[PDB]
């Protein structure tokens, strides 16, 4: 923000998508909130990993119970992907590269299905890539533009690789610590970015996926009232408590300055 | 001494000579008051004394029952013999009084609007030398037995504290960041002092016996590591290997910051350098001490032979720093003595005891 112009980068923009859920999605949404698993959990009798997994999953995509053109992972069944696939055409149309992240290895192979039943040019890397093939992909995508879109698993895209070469970003799936998020939209506007950027974070809204946007934002206001300022006002959009399980889809000093300043210090 | 004279206005030797050779011959002949009497206001014991860095007026004093009390020093009565009034307190009766003893108490170098103190009582209180109200205090989980200003410092004004814990603080009075601790010790810390050479030197003293002298800039824990025998091997950062055999509750820097006395339940002293913490072999003889507590001591500035001040029993005992002659005792106290300091000014000793007594010791004629 003090060396952007010091610095010549283009233009960013931080569109927050709030995506809506699709009637099986919010249908099997539903019926699992009101299971009694959760119900045991809110009793404090299971641990909880279990039931945020299974309703991450939910909102990435109804991979839970896998219901032609009705494979596994079909993108039609979750409304994140009918966004993604409009997004994707705009882009295509458009003749913009694209950068798709994503939590999880396995919706990023559903991810990966979607986009081989388009026509799109993709090119993946996850955890399970080779080490010593990775630089080299990055050093390709960074090269040839045919190579529309980009999937990455968060925990390898971002951390330090530099991918200037693409020009859009899409987050589908956000988490529990918001520097991955920070990270992964950062992959793109560095030193050396010639095109305006815009960032796409994925939400299904009054799901549990708004629920960790709140618990993020909290902690965004929690390290800028130390990094940035101690001003920060405070966090009021959620009260975070463990109600996160619920359904809500919308619709030098001369001894005075010392003496002063430490009175000052002790009238807060 | 009319040869000084000549010699001075002739050109022969430097004014250098007759004032250093005048001001020990001062010291040398240095006795209880002939001229002075330090007005009584302590109920008990006083344990500490400080003069002030600048003109060398005012001096603190704080009290074994809480009281502080800022004496003035010069002759305002047109006697030649008077008494030192006192100026303010902080009685029992201000609202910021410590609730026990008050173990040290220092005034701010480079300026005197402004005087802190510490105190059994776990609190290291920061007063106003004017308007005489604590603008802060630094609550501590431990009894804090010693601190030290350093007295050079134009850049950093942080303050160490050596408690009955293990570990060092370093409080700041820029803004207050009393976290800072340097590891390593490994009992109580009886004394700390700050090098008046070099910036950042500090050198701590625990119960443990052993002095270290840390870098307070550096993460590596101490620099150097006081042995008694100097031998060849290096060890870590730890209160152990003995510079003394017993307790070290004692520490002053000579003069210019150049070695480093220090004092020990074992009863003897020893002057190290403090470039590479090398037992300089002088050794004082038997100098008794069993204080339980912080000792303090001093050394004279501006006279031809560096000496020290150093309580003995009930009895200063002045020895002189490089060569260990013993040059008199003063006997004045009935109880022991914990406390003296040194006037460079005018080579004036003032000394404080258990026995609820401020003595004053000039020169004589």
């Known amino acids: 923000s003090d060396v952007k112009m010091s610095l010549s980068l283009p233009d960013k923009n931080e569109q927050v998508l709030f995506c809506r859920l699709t009637d099986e999605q919010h249908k099997v949404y539903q019926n699992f909130v009101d299971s009694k698993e959760v119900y045991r959990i809110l009793n404090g009798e299971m641990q909880i990993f279990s039931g945020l997994i299974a309703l991450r999953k939910i909102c990435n995509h109804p991979d839970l119970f896998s219901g032609e053109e009705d494979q596994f992972g079909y993108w039609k069944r979750s409304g994140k992907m009918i966004v993604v696939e409009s997004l994707l055409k705009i882009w295509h149309k458009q003749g913009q590269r694209v950068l798709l992240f994503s939590q999880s290895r396995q919706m990023l192979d559903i991810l990966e299905v979607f986009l081989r039943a388009q026509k799109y040019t993709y090119l993946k890397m996850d955890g399970t890539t080779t080490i010593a093939s990775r630089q080299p ?8 533009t045919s190579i529309f879109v980009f999937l990455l698993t968060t925990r390898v895209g971002g951390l330090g690789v530099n991918l200037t070469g693409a020009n859009r970003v899409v987050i589908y799936d956000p988490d529990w610590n918001p520097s991955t998020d920070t990270q992964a939209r950062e992959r793109a506007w560095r030193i050396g970015q010639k095109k305006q950027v815009t960032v ?4 299904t809204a009054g799901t549990i ?10 902690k965004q206001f929690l390290t800028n009232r130390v990094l940035k300022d101690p001003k920060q006002r405070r966090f009021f959009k ?3 408590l463990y109600e996160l399980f619920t359904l809500t889809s919308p619709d030098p000093l001369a001894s005075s300055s ?3 300043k430490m009175r000052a210090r002790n009238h807060l | 001494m009319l040869g000084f004279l000549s010699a001075r206005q002739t050109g022969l030797e430097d004014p250098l000579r007759l004032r250093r050779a005048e001001s020990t011959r001062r010291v040398l002949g240095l006795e209880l008051n002939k001229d002075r009497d330090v007005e009584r206001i302590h109920g008990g014991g006083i344990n500490t004394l400080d003069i002030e860095p600048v003109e060398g007026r005012y001096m603190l004093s704080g009290g074994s029952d809480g009281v502080i009390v800022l004496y003035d020093l010069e002759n305002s009565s047109r006697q030649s013999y008077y008494t030192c009034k ?3 307190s902080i009685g029992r009766d201000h609202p910021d009084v410590h ?5 040290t108490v220092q005034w701010y170098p480079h300026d005197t609007g402004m005087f802190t103190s510490s105190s059994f009582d776990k609190t290291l209180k920061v007063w106003d030398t004017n308007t005489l109200q604590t603008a802060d205090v630094f609550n501590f989980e431990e009894t804090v037995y010693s601190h030290h200003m350093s007295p050079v410092s134009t850049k950093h004004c942080l303050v160490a504290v050596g408690t009955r814990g293990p570990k060092v603080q370093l409080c700041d009075l820029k803004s207050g960041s009393c976290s800072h601790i340097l590891q390593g010790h490994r009992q109580e810390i009886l004394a700390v ?10 050198a701590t003293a625990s119960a443990d016996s052993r002095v270290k002298l840390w870098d307070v800039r550096r993460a590596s824990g101490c620099l150097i590591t006081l042995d008694q025998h100097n031998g060849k091997k290096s060890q870590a950062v730890e209160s152990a290997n003995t510079a003394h055999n017993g307790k070290v509750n004692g520490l002053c820097f000579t003069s210019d910051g150049l070695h480093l006395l220090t004092v020990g339940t074992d009863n003897r002293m020893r002057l190290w350098n403090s470039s590479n913490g090398e037992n300089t072999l002088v050794n004082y003889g038997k100098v008794c001490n069993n204080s339980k507590k912080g000792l303090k001591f001093t050394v004279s500035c501006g006279c031809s032979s560096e000496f020290v001040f150093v309580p003995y029993g009930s009895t200063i005992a002045v020895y002189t720093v490089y060569s260990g002659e013993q040059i008199t005792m003063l006997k004045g106290h009935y109880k022991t003595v914990d406390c003296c300091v040194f006037q460079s000014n005018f080579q004036e000793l003032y000394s404080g005891s258990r026995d609820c007594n401020i003595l004053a010791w000039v020169p004589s004629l």
């Open chain 1, 209 to 218: 996926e708004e629920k960790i946007y709140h618990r993020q934002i909290f």
């Open chain 2, 99 to 103: 609730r026990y003893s008050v173990e």
């Open chain 2, 193 to 202: 002092s700050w090098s008046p050479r070099y910036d950042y030197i500090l």
């Open chain 2, 86 to 88: 006192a100026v303010c």
């Open chain 1, 137 to 144: 992909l990055i050093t390709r995508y960074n090269e040839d």
């Open chain 1, 258 to 260: 010392l003496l002063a």
């Open chain 1, 238 to 240: 959620s009260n975070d």
């Open chain 1, 200 to 203: 796409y974070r994925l939400l």
